[PDB]
């Protein structure tokens, strides 16, 4: 399974972790068997002005199951009022860029 | 407050919605001990100290 995250989030790619990546993007099972390999790619995945082609999920109704892949872009309801697909107060776009 | 003289706020007799805090994008650390961060709204406490 290959993907890009920022340095501080590398620790989240492990069993028993929590956080925006562990919970909403890429979840590993507590009984995971395997190896997590990472390297700095600042010379590839960064650009002047900011590289906005790498996204992560910031909001979700619930945590992901192990190896679940959620790629929806539906507006997240933070409040008690239905968003009806329109972002605004208490209605968030679920993804964000690393830049 | 300074860490050597930290400030304790006693919280009681109220409704505690912890999803507002947990689902926030504005915090870099949110680590719960002795309790799941997603079960907090199902629990009742005799007091909360912030």
């Amino acid at each position, epitope marked *: 399974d290959s993907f890009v995250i920022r340095g501080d989030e590398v620790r989240q790619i492990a069993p028993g972790q929590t956080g925006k990546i562990a919970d909403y993007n890429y979840k590993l099972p507590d009984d995971f068997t395997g190896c997590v390999i990472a390297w700095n790619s600042n010379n590839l995945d960064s650009k002047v002005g*900011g590289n906005y082609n790498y996204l992560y999920r910031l909001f979700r109704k619930s945590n992901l199951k192990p190896f679940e892949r959620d790629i929806s872009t539906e507006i997240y309801q933070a409040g008690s009022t239905p968003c009806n697909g329109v972002e605004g107060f208490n209605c968030y776009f679920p993804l964000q860029s*690393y830049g | 407050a300074s860490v050597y003289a930290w400030n304790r706020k006693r919280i009681s007799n109220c409704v505690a919605d912890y999803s507002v805090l947990y689902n926030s*994008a*504005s915090f870099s650390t949110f680590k719960c001990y002795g309790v799941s961060p997603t079960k907090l709204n199902d629990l009742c406490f005799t007091n909360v100290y912030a």
Partner: antibody
Amino acid sequence: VQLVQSGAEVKKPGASVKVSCKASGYTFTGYYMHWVRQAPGQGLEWMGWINPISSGTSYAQTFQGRVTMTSDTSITTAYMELSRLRSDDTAVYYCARAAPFYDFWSGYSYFDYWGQGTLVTV
Amino acid sequence: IVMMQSPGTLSLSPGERATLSCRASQSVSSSYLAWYQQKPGQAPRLLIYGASSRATGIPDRFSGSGSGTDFTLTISRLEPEDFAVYYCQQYGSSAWTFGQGTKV
């Protein structure tokens, strides 16, 4: 944090104008880009905003139906296109940065950075 | 909503204190009230947000306070660069509203 807008424009009534705003010094998609108008001798009027991550927008009822906001994250630039220009649209147009609605400390309630005003004459 | 500032014009000597007022037609959360400074020929800059919090780069000569429908901006000592137009700004109902502005 810098916001750099295009130069002044002169348009005839019925024409459309597109004002750009290039952002730098921050994560472009981490903030909403707002546009604020200031007619000569008048105060500041909020027009609307765009959220570059999705290009979702919201407009003031005053401009809704006439103004379209777009953005391009690859060049961290926001655009505001105001159609059907009238003589009373003569104003200095500013781009301004504010936090997204999910900001815990309500950074969306105000504009912390502004670009240089761009004068549009109609 | 209507945000009404007063006085329309404020005139006093450098080195003295000035108080600028902004009244709301309805209650405004302190978290949603901001003050801006606009020098002639320049874009507005943020001075105060959240009713009382200074923006980064703003001198401690500037302070704000208030709640409900009555907010103020205070300049403890006026410098030549403080003789500009000030605005109050409110957020609510998914909209941003500015006052008419006052000139110092």
